[PDB]
Design a protein around this ligand. Structure first.
Ligand SMILES: *[B]([O])([O])[C][N]C(=O)/C(=N\OC([C])([C])C([O])=O)C1=[C]SC([N])=N1
Length: 358
């Protein structure tokens, strides 16, 4: 724990926790490929349980990075192709608006306006078929980007079908295990409950509620140690022994579309380093992050650019997370909190910290 890291982290995080009234928080700073941990406050205010390196946090949308990579792994295995139409893996989708909508589109939120949230009323697998069949695009495929759980979530569900495995089983076997993320779960087992932090929303303790496509779009829980390890894997996919997993990771960082100065990958979103902090900070605000925007296809997709600021925000009703790394610098950071505080404040803290380290 070099004093340099120690100092920036505390100079930055301390005012952050106090300004946003964050109950508990864990931070991992990956400097030169090595992880450094810091923890603050409570995992459970009522039971006086402190946040520790073993505490599980709801990752929220950061879960999409795992989905993008698992999907990339499927492509690498030859099981699916991003150019394949959605209907090849779901022949039941017969509504004409699906012609021309590929897995690339679902994966990158460019199908033409799929909503951010899957309606609450959608429960059964037939309830989901009905939803997609009736959904009407506001735009032609591959022309507009609208960040949505219903889009990349569907991608994740379809991507694992050829494997014959269930989404959780596929995730575990192909991503969590190889990478030794042994305290990362889609479903927290009873044995681990004691490490599961409570999220906080307006003073009330809450955990994520079951929902359609939840596992695929925002349902992973993890500890600061595993997330640090997840960052290390996306920083250096070459150190990864499983051939298809290594490719998948790289495929998740390929640049498929560009909007503003941001490029869409599979789950991960990227910008060229050096970046203008104002651009990632203001751009992380939902004002922009959830807004519908025109996208320029990158034909063909640019392979993962090492000099990139790669990141993803994440949130549930009671949690707020952020992951950002610069491959070229072997530099990264993970910020986990059991409070959904504003994205801009997250990115600003990560920026000050990482910028201070090169
Ligand atoms: B991801 O975290 O970017 C997607 N997030 C969500 O789907 C959830 N909340 O995001 C919104 C609704 C924009 C918010 O209020 O911040 C979400 C999933 S489960 C849950 N309770 N909230």
């Amino acid at each position: 724990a070099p004093q340099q890291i120690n100092d920036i982290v505390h100079r930055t995080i301390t005012p952050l926790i106090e300004q946003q009234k964050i109950p508990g928080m864990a931070v991992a700073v990956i400097y030169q490929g090595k992880p450094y941990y810091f923890t603050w406050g409570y995992a459970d205010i009522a039971k006086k349980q402190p946040v520790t390196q073993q505490t599980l946090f709801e990752l929220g949308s950061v879960s999409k990075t795992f989905t993008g990579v698992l999907g990339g792994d499927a492509i690498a295995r030859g099981e699916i192709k991003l150019s394949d139409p959605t209907t090849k893996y779901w022949p039941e989708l017969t509504a004409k608006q699906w012609n021309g909508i590929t897995l690339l589109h679902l994966a990158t939120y460019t199908a033409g306006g799929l909503p951010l949230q899957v309606p609450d009323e959608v429960k059964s697998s037939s309830d989901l078929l009905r939803f997609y069949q009736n959904w009407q695009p506001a735009w032609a495929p591959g022309t507009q980007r609208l960040y949505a759980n219903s889009s990349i979530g569907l991608f994740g569900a379809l991507a694992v079908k050829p494997s014959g495995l269930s989404f959780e089983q596929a995730m575990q076997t192909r991503v969590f295990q190889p990478l030794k993320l042994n305290h990362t779960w889609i479903n927290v087992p009873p044995a681990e409950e004691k490490n599961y932090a409570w999220g906080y929303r307006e003073g009330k303790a809450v955990h994520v509620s079951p929902g359609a496509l939840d596992a695929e779009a925002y349902g992973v829980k993890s500890t600061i140690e595993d997330m640090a390890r997840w960052v290390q894997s996306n920083l250096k996919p070459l150190d990864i022994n499983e051939k298809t997993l290594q490719q998948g990771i790289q495929l998740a960082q390929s640049r498929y579309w560009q909007t503003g100065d941001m490029y869409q990958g599979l789950g991960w979103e990227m910008l060229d380093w050096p970046v203008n902090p104002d651009s990632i900070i203001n751009g992380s605000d939902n004002k922009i992050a959830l807004a519908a925007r025109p996208v320029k296809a990158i034909t063909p997709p640019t392979p993962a650019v090492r000099a990139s600021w790669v990141h993803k925000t994440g949130a549930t009703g009671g949690f707020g997370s952020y992951v950002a790394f610069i491959p070229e610098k072997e530099l990264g950071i993970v910020m986990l909190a059991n409070k959904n505080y504003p994205n801009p404040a997250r990115v600003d803290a990560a920026w000050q910290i990482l910028n201070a380290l090169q």
